[PDB]
Amino acid sequence: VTIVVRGSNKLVIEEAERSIHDALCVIRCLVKKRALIAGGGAPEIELALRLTEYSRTLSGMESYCVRAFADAMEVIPSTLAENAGLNPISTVTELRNRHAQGEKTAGINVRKGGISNILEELVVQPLLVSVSALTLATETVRSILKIDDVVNTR
């Protein structure tokens, strides 16, 4: 099949082509793994909550590190709250409070300007995207932690 892309400028044509490629790759990801998950920052906040709970179980220095991992997952919701002109502290606190007492599909609604169920707004994404992102990020950090020198060569 062929797609013909039209536009009034070269730059907008390039951006349109990139966007169409994004959508095509998303559908391909959905084909690869028949699984769906809720967007809008819900996975990150739930991950932070559950890892904070899990940290209490562990004992020793390891516990501290796990807690740090959890605190590094709330950057995505906070950013989503900042870009929309919302208050990040209140928004993230409300997200955590609502995720800690039941329903796990809460998220940031920019149309409503607040916090609400995310499936009612019909924003979803594949699971492979999140899983691959987390795995690659963790592997890259582990690789970076192994370095202790810089040498200038020819």
């Binding site: 009034s8 400028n9 730059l11």
Partner: protein
């Protein structure tokens, strides 16, 4: 900086936004003085001393050197408007710049750019929908009057302004002479098939329309005739020179007695071709290739005209008009070469005319189809070039009017009506898109303001009068006919422009609005610039 070793320069935040806006504004300020029947022209001089006189937005923006991207976007916008439609290349830049300025005024307040973008899109869609109520069907009017008025309106503000009637009649006749007979689902009018030639000399009122075709070429030799009454025309696409063998073939001689008969053959083969052409009664032969001096003698003796180095497109137009057939070779569906008399065109007269110390060729009254050409006279070369550029606009406008049977008033009636309607319609949204729609409506109002300012009139009072009249038109249905009162610039008062005869195709307005909105949206989204250092 410190972080992000980039060996470039980075700008972020309102700063870059403001900078971008200023760039756009500058471009508008270059052309704002060339809009309307009162605006004047521009002179451009390069580094070596060539002078170009023009008031065409596309030409000015193409000849300038620009390097800020936010201005190159507008330059390409003007080029696209020229390609798609062919008129209104100055108004679209003004509209886009004003939209960008009014949107930045809101974005300086804590209004998110996405809301402005959505409001702009909604306003553009609704304005395009509403314009289809201001239409006039040209078949309802008398067709010739509508066409003449459209052409004369397009021609105003150009060097051929006061001569609007003469050139309007010429343009309408030339366009009607080119109408082609398609499948008959819809007729088509292929403009730029009408040749335009320039020759300085007599006054511009001595420009002529030729019912036929005009070639900027001269006869091959001074011994040939220079006028044929009943013309039989053969069009060729190959050179008539003494034959040479191709790269693969070579001559090796071991017996001297066989040399001479070879050297004759090279001079004979081509002759045997020419006779085949001349045996069918052909008088005029046109060739895109060259003709040797040895071959010109056959035409000279036979009493015929031969023209060499004819452009391909001119040959295509001549062959299509006169009914002839273009031949790249004489070979047929058998092994031999023949020339038949059924592939000859017929013309009622062929002349070589003299114009201001040079010569050119006229082919008059072709029989297969009608064709046209225009010869433009002026004081010098700059004037003639400006007239050609002006005439192209009128030809394109008349083509658009004929293809799409609808016209729209001019002078600023559309802008005032749309501003009133969109300002009224913005109340129903009741959101942050209301502000964006109101700014769209207020930005549409820059055209009548510029028109009044260029005429050195009171812009504020005149625009207020227009808005009051159109407001009284939108309510109180018994006065619906006030939606056509435009603007009169030679006296400074409104006047009914539909009866006054100021018309324009609706496609101009539609495409200008769409393209301007797209450009404003695509520029309104940038919040960070990174400029890398040269290598």
């Amino acid at each position: 900086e410190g972080p992000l070793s980039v060996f470039g320069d980075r700008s972020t935040g309102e700063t870059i936004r403001s900078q971008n806006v200023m760039a756009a504004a500058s471009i508008a300020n270059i052309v704002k003085s060339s809009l309307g029947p009162v605006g004047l022209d521009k002179m451009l001089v390069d580094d070596i001393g060539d002078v170009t006189i023009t008031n065409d937005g596309a030409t000015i923006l193409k000849l300038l050197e620009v390097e800020h991207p936010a201005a190159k976007v507008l330059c390409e916008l003007a080029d696209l408007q020229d390609k798609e439609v062919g008129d209104g290349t100055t108004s679209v830049v003004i509209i886009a710049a004003e939209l960008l300025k009014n949107a930045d005024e809101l974005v300086k307040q804590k209004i998110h750019p996405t809301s402005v973008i959505s409001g702009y899109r909604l306003a553009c869609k609704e304005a395009v929908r509403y314009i289809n109520e201001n239409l006039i069907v040209n078949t309802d009017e008398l067709g010739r009057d509508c066409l003449i008025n459209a052409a004369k309106t397009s021609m105003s503000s150009k060097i051929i302004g006061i001569n609007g009637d003469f050139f309007a009649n010429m343009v309408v006749d030339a366009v009607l002479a080119i109408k082609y007979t398609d499948i008959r689902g819809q007729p088509r009018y292929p403009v730029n098939s009408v040749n335009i030639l320039k020759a300085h000399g007599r006054s511009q009122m001595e420009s002529m329309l030729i019912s036929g075709y005009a070639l900027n070429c001269v006869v091959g030799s001074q011994g040939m005739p220079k006028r044929i009454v009943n013309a039989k025309i053969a069009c060729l696409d190959f050179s008539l020179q003494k034959t040479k063998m191709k790269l693969g073939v070579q001559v090796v001689i071991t017996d001297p007695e066989k040399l001479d008969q070879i050297r004759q053959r090279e001079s004979d083969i081509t002759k045997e071709r020419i006779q085949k052409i001349l045996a069918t009664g052909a008088n005029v032969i046109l060739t895109t290739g060259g003709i040797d001096d040895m071959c010109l003698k056959y035409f000279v003796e036979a009493g015929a005209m031969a023209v060499r180095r004819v452009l391909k497109r001119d040959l295509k137009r001549i062959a299509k008009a006169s009914g002839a057939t273009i031949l790249s070779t004489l070979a047929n569906l058998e092994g031999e070469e023949t020339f038949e008399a059924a592939m000859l065109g017929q013309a009622e007269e062929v002349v070589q005319e003299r114009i201001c110390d040079d010569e050119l060729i006229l082919i008059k009254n072709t029989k297969a189809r009608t064709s046209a050409s225009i010869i433009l006279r002026g004081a010098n070369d700059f004037m003639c070039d400006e007239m050609e550029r002006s005439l192209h606009d009128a030809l394109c406008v008349v083509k658009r009017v004929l293809e799409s049977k609808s016209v729209v008033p001019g002078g600023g009636a559309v802008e005032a009506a749309l501003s009133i309607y969109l300002e009224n319609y913005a109340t129903s949204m009741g959101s942050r898109e209301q502000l964006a729609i109101a700014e769209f409506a207020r930005s549409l109002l820059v055209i009548p303001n510029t028109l009044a300012v260029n005429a050195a009139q009171d812009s504020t009072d005149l625009v207020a009068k227009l808005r009051a009249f159109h407001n009284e038109a939108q309510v109180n249905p018994e006065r619906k006919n006030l939606k056509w009162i435009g603007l009169d610039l030679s006296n400074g008062k409104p006047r009914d422009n539909k009866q006054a005869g100021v018309f324009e195709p609706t496609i101009v307005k539609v495409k200008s609005l769409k393209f301007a909105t797209e450009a404003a949206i695509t520029i309104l989204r940038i919040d960070d610039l990174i400029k890398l250092h040269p290598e």
